[PDB]
Write a protein that binds this ligand. Structure first.
Ligand code: NAG
Ligand code: NAG
Ligand code: NAG
Ligand code: NAG
Ligand code: CL
Ligand code: CL
Ligand code: ZN
Ligand code: ZN
Lengths: 98, 595, 595
């Protein structure tokens, strides 16, 4: 938006790296100093999530990019996940391969 | 967690927030400049105050790190650029006093108007009218009176303010663990913490004096030639062996001698190389000029401009309905947003200025991947040098005839070459002594080597000795000639125009070697030279993340400033002047004066 | 094979043999202490002499390594701890003289007995009788005469010995590449060879002075309060604005003000928290107390005591048929053998002392996996601090009511809290100035800044200035008050009781943050705090294999000593004193004296 889309947030500080396919909604104050800060935003105690503020005047490097990951793996129960199987026509009075 | 991790986290947070807020502020300032309206003015104002308050509070929070335990040179430099207390070190009273002094200085210089004895209602201000006279007036008395009255009116009122500003800045910088404000200014070239590339503030003065020692001969011969040529235009006023008056340099302060080409033209029968009429015949416009500059820059091997550049940048005056500042400006709004504001007309001057602005934007884009506190040039002079090398390489006849501006049925000759070299020397090497003496006088004043009761005396003596410009009439000590200049009264460093003027030729001579040049340095063109383009980009990419000496070594191969390329550029002009500067005694006698 | 391999092999062999021999010696000493008999005495004697001779010959063999080519910090520290020549550097004559001087000093201090003019056969020695008087006597003249006579009898005889001991130790330490014996003592806190954690001997004095600069206000107010309260008990002898006599501090030397609680009790109507009678009603014993301490320690996350502890340790006096020293002692015999010797009675004091000894044994077991030369605390003060933090956390009302000692029908109030805080300040912060001034005087004497003819004068002046304790009567220079103390005449460092007193609160405040405390620091309990226990064990495990600064950083997060936790502990008491210390002028005038 011309005024900046601040609805998209991203994590900037975390105690450790996330595991594969891990999801963390925690919004606790990241302890960057020595004391716990008692859960207040101040010096050496920063909020983990930061905003983006996408604008139409940003450069290609900073413009927003919608990313998706459809992701397909293997187990036991047979599945209905199977591509469309197409079709042909129906001929009669001639031996063909069906 | 050691202090290093805290510093890194704070620097990342500051990078993000300052990038956002600086983009906001630059966008507001661009909206104001491109459209002068009260709403855009308010937007610029509130954005600027919020950004400045954010920066101040961040610097206050940054001072909580000792900075001696840290070892990462990058974080160290970021903190140094962000931990500088600045003017807040002095008590609030001194702060208010210095702010008021600066404001009144700037306003008196801007709102200065001189009344004249010709008519009780014939006052003219500085920018219009007075500059027209000082540039085109051929009458001795007229320009003399104007040059004397402007000073007697502005410097006499600014002297009580300068007497306060000098001491205030001295007490401010000294509180910052410096020697004086002159030393605080020299801190830009300070390099520490990296052996083999370090550079102290005190070495700058010595190196500048060493370079001027080699600049002197060429300037001496140029001054002798200009004097010998001015005797016919201003007879009965100039000496054969004496210095030159201050009101015959072509401008109010004599900073540039461009206005003297009309009088000191070696061969005025043949006109200079001008492609103005050749552009209108081909129906050229701002879009075409900028696209040609783009093709030239990419031919050297640099990336193409951003899509938003051609979309958001205003390259032509829409008329007096969307009023904007007509000054050529490069706008790096940040976050990949780059624009150029310029009222591009169909003229060779506009062509060169567009090339300069495009080179500046290319430099800005080079270090775009660096932190916010390091998204800047190596020093105050590298940016303008990188911008001027492009205009130099573009103004060559070969480049003008390769893109279709100059007709192929025209081969350059020695006469036009000498004319162009001399006209370039009027502004490149003709202004080096002025800048050098001004900076030396300012440094000596800030250090206290010149007592308060010897300011103007020492100023005029240094002028006579270095620049060879004598005072037209006796000046009382209540005068203040240095304050009459914009950069002096507005508290702006002036040494950048000297170090940058040298870096320009240092880069020009460093890129010609890569292009396999085979002629004089003034005929070099870096076009179609991929190796030179890559060598330059390898330095522009660094920006401020590395010392300026290391950056200079990447392109020129030298760790320290060098002026030999400057002399090599004007070597043919130097030989021509030496061959012509034998009809009279070369040099000037400082003891002689026109009064 | 480089010198490093030889050093490693020698260190392994020495580790094995010294472990064996030190276990033998500790076993002999334990058999002696637990049973005072001539046979056990002979066993202790021969074991000790053989162990000392082995150590001396090993150190002699260890000196064959230059120690400059080695790079392993562990082997370096082991050699430094084993290569110290010690007293053998001086010639044998000086060795015999210093040994005789030390022996006669110790014996004269121990065998010192004062005859009195009350009766020709009414002499009483120091430990019994004299301490009883100095603690419980309310008569001015009695305690004054006792305090004067003990000094006049002991210091006057020790002064000729101290005049020799000082110079002998100075010539001994100086031969060891040190400045003086005072600097040799400060070598314990010396950290070198590791940038970022190094610590020089000279920085200790500066840091101690900086910490005392912050300790002063609280001590000033405490002294003012004690003085204002003593005016009623000792009228006609104390000044409103002057210092306090030396014989009204509650002990022979005033090291601790515990005996002044009976006189300076804020609210004597309510008795202090005492669980003595509550223990006998539940049929408590040494076994139960030690098992409760075990459950408390394991609740924090520390390992359980060894099986041999409950089997080999003697926790209760078997009576006067197996006579033993009744002093609370922690015995680390080595090779996984740990025991505690204490005549545990049914009393809160015994409870706290057992907690302290169990904490000491836990610390000893922490670094059990380290070499013999590194099986020790970070410094001389870390062990006692780790032992005292446990007694502090255990004496809280919440802990006493959680284990069943304090009745649940009792909620603490502000009166008892203030009483307990003040009674703790009488011994924790009330003794810090004494230790500080004593150590400073000893350092200045060893360095030679105090001439021989100004010892007692400077001592009394420093006392008046720092501790605010004036001399009761004029003292001639033949007196020796410092030698009257055990730690001074017996050649024992005294700064440990200051650095340790600060490390105590540094750890207390560092562990409360992990336990998520929500109240004052004096109410914190590390019980059931697994994170605090693990953070502490991560430091106790290091022992001496790492610098003491790095160890302090592991728990407290700071590289250097800090006293702010000490002030935070007594912050409520400080506010209460400030509110009460307004009826008279705070401070003392050193110019006033009772004579
Ligand atoms: C210095 O900072 C850079 C960039 O953040 C980081 O990649 C690097 O690990 C740092 N090095 C040190 C020595 O801290
Ligand atoms: C660069 O190459 C272009 C394309 O052939 C050519 O027109 C031009 O002459 C070249 N420029 C120079 C001067 O090298
Ligand atoms: C230092 O000594 C220890 C114990 O002998 C050994 O484990 C370590 O590898 C040594 N380090 C070096 C590189 O000498
Ligand atoms: C520790 O845990 C035990 C068992 O839950 C509890 O009885 C005791 O009160 C706790 N102590 C404290 C004060 O944390
Ligand atoms: Cl001037
Ligand atoms: Cl004493
Ligand atoms: Zn420019
Ligand atoms: Zn102990």
């Amino acid at each position: 938006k011309v005024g900046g889309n601040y609805n998209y947030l991203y994590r900037l500080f975390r105690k450790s790296n996330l595991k594969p396919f891990e999801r963390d909604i925690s919004t606790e104050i990241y302890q960057a100093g020595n004391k716990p800060c008692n859960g207040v935003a101040g010096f050496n105690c920063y909020f983990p999530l930061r905003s983006y503020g996408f604008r139409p005047t940003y450069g290609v490097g900073h413009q927003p990019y919608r990313v998706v990951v459809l992701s397909f793996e293997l187990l036991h129960a047979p599945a209905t996940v199977c591509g469309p199987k197409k079709s042909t026509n129906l001929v009669k009075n001639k031996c063909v391969n069906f | 967690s050691t202090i290093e991790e805290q510093a890194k986290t704070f620097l990342d947070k500051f990078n993000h927030e300052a990038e956002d807020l600086f983009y906001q502020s630059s966008l507001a300032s661009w909206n104001y400049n491109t459209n002068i309206t009260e709403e855009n003015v308010q937007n610029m104002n509130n954005a600027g105050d919020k950004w400045s308050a954010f920066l101040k509070e961040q610097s206050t929070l940054a001072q909580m790190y000792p900075l001696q335990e840290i070892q990462n040179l990058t974080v160290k430099l970021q903190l140094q650029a962000l931990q500088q207390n600045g003017s807040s070190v002095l008590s609030e009273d001194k702060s208010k006093r210095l702010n008021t002094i600066l404001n009144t200085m700037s306003t008196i210089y801007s709102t200065g108007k001189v009344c004249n004895p010709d008519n009780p209602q014939e006052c003219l201000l500085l920018e219009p009218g007075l500059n027209e006279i000082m540039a085109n007036s051929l009458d001795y008395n007229e320009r003399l009176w104007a040059w004397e009255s402007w000073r007697s009116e502005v410097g006499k009122q600014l002297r009580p303010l300068y007497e306060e500003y000098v001491v205030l800045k001295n007490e401010m910088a000294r509180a910052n663990h410096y020697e004086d404000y002159g030393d605080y200014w020299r801190g830009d070239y300070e390099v520490n913490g990296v052996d083999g590339y370090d550079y102290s503030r005190g070495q700058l003065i010595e190196d500048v004096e060493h370079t001027f020692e080699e600049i002197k001969p060429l300037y001496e011969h140029l001054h002798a030639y200009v004097r010998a040529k001015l005797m016919n235009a201003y007879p009965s006023y100039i000496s054969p062996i004496g210095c030159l008056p201050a009101h015959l340099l072509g401008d109010m302060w004599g900073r540039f001698w461009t206005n003297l080409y009309s009088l000191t033209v070696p061969f005025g029968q043949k006109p200079n190389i001008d492609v103005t009429d050749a552009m209108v015949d081909q129906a050229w416009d701002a879009q075409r000029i900028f696209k040609e500059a783009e093709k030239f820059f990419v031919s050297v091997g640099l990336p193409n401009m951003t899509q938003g550049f051609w979309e958001n940048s205003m390259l032509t005056d829409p008329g007096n309905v969307q009023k904007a500042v007509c000054h050529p400006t490069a706008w790096d709004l940040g976050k990949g947003d780059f624009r150029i504001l310029m009222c591009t007309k169909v003229t060779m001057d506009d062509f060169l200025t567009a090339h300069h602005e495009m080179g500046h934007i290319q430099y800005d884009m080079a270090y775009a991947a660096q932190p916010f506190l390091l998204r800047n040039g190596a020093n105050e002079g590298f940016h303008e040098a990188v911008g001027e090398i492009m205009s130099l390489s573009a103004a060559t006849p070969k480049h003008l005839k390769s893109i279709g501006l100059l007709s192929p049925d025209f081969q350059e000759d020695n006469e036009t070459e000498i004319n162009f070299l001399l006209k370039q020397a009027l502004t490149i090497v003709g202004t080096l002594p002025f800048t050098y003496m001004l900076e030396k006088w300012r440094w000596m004043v800030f250090k206290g080597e010149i007592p308060k009761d010897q300011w103007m005396k020492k100023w005029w003596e240094m002028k006579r000795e270095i620049v060879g410009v004598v005072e037209p009439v006796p000046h009382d000590e209540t005068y203040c000639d240095p304050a009459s200049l914009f950069h002096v009264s507005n508290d702006y460093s002036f040494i950048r125009y000297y170090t940058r003027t040298l870096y320009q030729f240092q880069f020009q001579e460093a890129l010609c070697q890569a292009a396999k040049h085979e002629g004089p340095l003034h005929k070099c063109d870096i076009s179609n030279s991929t190796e030179a383009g890559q060598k330059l980009f390898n330095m522009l990419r660094l920006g401020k993340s590395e010392p300026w000496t290391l950056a200079l070594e990447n392109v020129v191969g030298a760790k320290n400033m060098n002026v030999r390329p400057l002399l090599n550029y004007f070597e043919p002009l130097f030989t021509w002047l030496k061959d012509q500067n034998k009809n009279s005694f070369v040099g000037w006698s400082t003891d002689w004066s026109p009064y």
